[PDB]
Structure 1
Amino acid sequence: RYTKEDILKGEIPEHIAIIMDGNGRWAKKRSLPRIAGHHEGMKVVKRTTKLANELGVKVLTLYAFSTENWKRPKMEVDFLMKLPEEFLNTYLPELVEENVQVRIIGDETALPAHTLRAIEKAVQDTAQNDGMILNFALNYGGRTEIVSAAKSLAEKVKEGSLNIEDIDESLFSTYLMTESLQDPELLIRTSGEIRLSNFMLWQVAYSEFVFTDVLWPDFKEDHFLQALGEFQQRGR
């Protein structure tokens, strides 16, 4: 068992990445509509964002909407696409006071313009902050990301701006959506699924993984600290 000051004892991952799964199953379990659970999960986002920022986490990356989530019922998809506005309308000033930097990774051209408009004002309103980086992964997939790196590098070779022999691992990393950000030392996934689901495939080559049966809406600060306690046990 762990509590907080025992966690500050040790290493705090500079970059944590979380697959926020299990919202539907949390609402189903309470005899609630699935959209209720998405809404509950929205609170745990900022509650987790605040705790990680006190601890000194420097990048928090949260998988909000997968490329494969487009296939869900249209009423749900449209509600999920309204959650960023609702989240920012509720928490953005708090995030400004907390020195947070809001950022987005994924293919944005596929979001409704009312969802994009709201996000981009968040990014600008927190641009000149230098605190913790809050990365929402929205319409994000690892294979797409890797292919678009290859296509970009290929296009520069085609134009003569890049020699093939200068393409190495580190150069490849800079054409990923994660840009120059450091790779996540710790990946957390809730809801009892033990898989990666096409999330950040390159970037978690060496990450530690922590899977929990806890559903995302139930993922309060002690579960989060316990996940950090696991991380500190991992060697080599």
Structure 2
Amino acid sequence: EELDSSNIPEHIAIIMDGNGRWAKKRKMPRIKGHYEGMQTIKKITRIASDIGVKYLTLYAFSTENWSRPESEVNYIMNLPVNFLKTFLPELIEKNVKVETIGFTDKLPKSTIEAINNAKEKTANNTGLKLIFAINYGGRAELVHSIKNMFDELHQQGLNSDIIDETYINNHLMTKDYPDPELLIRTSGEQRISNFLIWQVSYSEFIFNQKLWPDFDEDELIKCIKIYQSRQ
């Protein structure tokens, strides 16, 4: 039917794929697609907020070569620095709370500052939680969470008997958020590329054909409608 405003997913996760491809189709360097992709983030953040989404996890990843995803994980163009610097005022006004998951400790000093300022300035907002997965990988997340949990247990002198599914959820970088009911990936590529592998165990998947730069509010609504129709 039409968009059911009373069944809007609390948490939508999106792999923003297509910036490079979009640029290449127009014989332009990837930076042009990176810029347009940034505009898509603004559009999607506003509409998500306006329809009731409470958590939005975005993973910047551009499929260049299907067999080389490692090149994207820590690539500068997958950073939301430009977005945060040019849209922060709006985020603040829109009651959006900025957060991040991933390994950011080794990012450029000026990058850490930009991200921290964004968080600090929106720390008190109570609306949509805009979560950027930066230099993130599900396997790396688990490996990291496993190491800590082990030390946390040994330090406290305990056995592995307390380790269960719930324990793991509370020790992932996503411990403060419910798992996404819906995972969307643009461009038509159908993989989760090591993104929230544990968290999307029960998520509904939607592989949207449009390139991230062309993805818009209308398309988002359509994805949620599909989500609602599939029950």
Question: How far is the alpha carbon of 1:70 from its aligned partner?
Answer: 5.2
Matched with 1:68 is 70
1:190 has 2:192 as partner: no
Match of 1:27 among 14, 23, 35: 23
Q: Secondary structure at the match of 2:135?
A: strand
Tell me the number of residue pairs that the alignment of Structure 1 and Structure 2 aligns: 225
Q: How does 1:193-212 map to 2 (within 5 A)?
A: 193-212=189-208
Question: Are the equivalent residues in 1 in contact too, given 2:73–2:136 (CA < 8 A)?
Answer: no
How large is the Cα RMSD of the aligned pairs?
Answer: 1.9
Question: How far is the alpha carbon of 1:111 from its aligned partner?
Answer: 1.5
Match of 2:42 among 42, 46, 52: 46
Deviations 1:26-53 (A, max 9, x none): 0111121111101110010011000000
CA pair 104-32 structure 1, distance change in 2 beyond 3 A:
same
Deviations 1:68-89 (A, max 9, x none): 23589xxxx44x26x5332122
Matched with 1:157 is 153
**Whole-Å separation in 2 of the counterparts to 1:180 and 1:162:** 24
Question: Are the equivalent residues in 1 in contact too, given 2:97–2:123 (CA < 8 A)?
Answer: yes
Matched with 2:92 is 96
In terms of fraction of residues, the more helix-rich structure is 1
Deviations 1:147-190 (A, max 9, x none): 11111111012112544211111111111010221000000000
Paired letter, 1:85: V
Bigger Cα displacement from structure 2, 161-170 vs 188-197? 161-170
Q: Secondary structure at the match of 1:210?
A: strand
Match of 1:124 among 112, 120, 127: 120
**Whole-Å separation in 1 of the counterparts to 2:54 and 2:171:** 21
Q: Secondary structure at the match of 1:156?
A: helix
Structure 1 length normalisation: TM-score? 0.90
Question: Are the equivalent residues in 1 in contact too, given 2:73–2:135 (CA < 8 A)?
Answer: no
CA pair 232-36 structure 1, distance change in 2 beyond 3 A:
same
Q: Secondary structure at the match of 1:18?
A: strand
Question: How far is the alpha carbon of 1:110 from its aligned partner?
Answer: 2.7
Q: Which runs of 5+ in 2 are unaligned?
A: 63-68
Bigger Cα displacement from structure 2, 11-20 vs 111-120? 111-120
Question: Are the equivalent residues in 1 in contact too, given 2:38–2:83 (CA < 8 A)?
Answer: yes
Q: Secondary structure at the match of 1:191?
A: coil
1:167 has 2:169 as partner: no
Bigger Cα displacement from structure 2, 180-189 vs 107-116? 107-116
Q: Which runs of 5+ in 1 are unaligned?
A: none
Question: How far is the alpha carbon of 1:65 from its aligned partner?
Answer: 5.3
**Whole-Å separation in 2 of the counterparts to 1:85 and 1:59:** 20
Matched with 2:66 is none
Structure 2 length normalisation: TM-score? 0.91
**Whole-Å separation in 1 of the counterparts to 2:56 and 2:183:** 10
Match of 2:129 among 129, 133, 138: 133
Matched with 2:214 is 218
**Whole-Å separation in 2 of the counterparts to 1:28 and 1:107:** 29
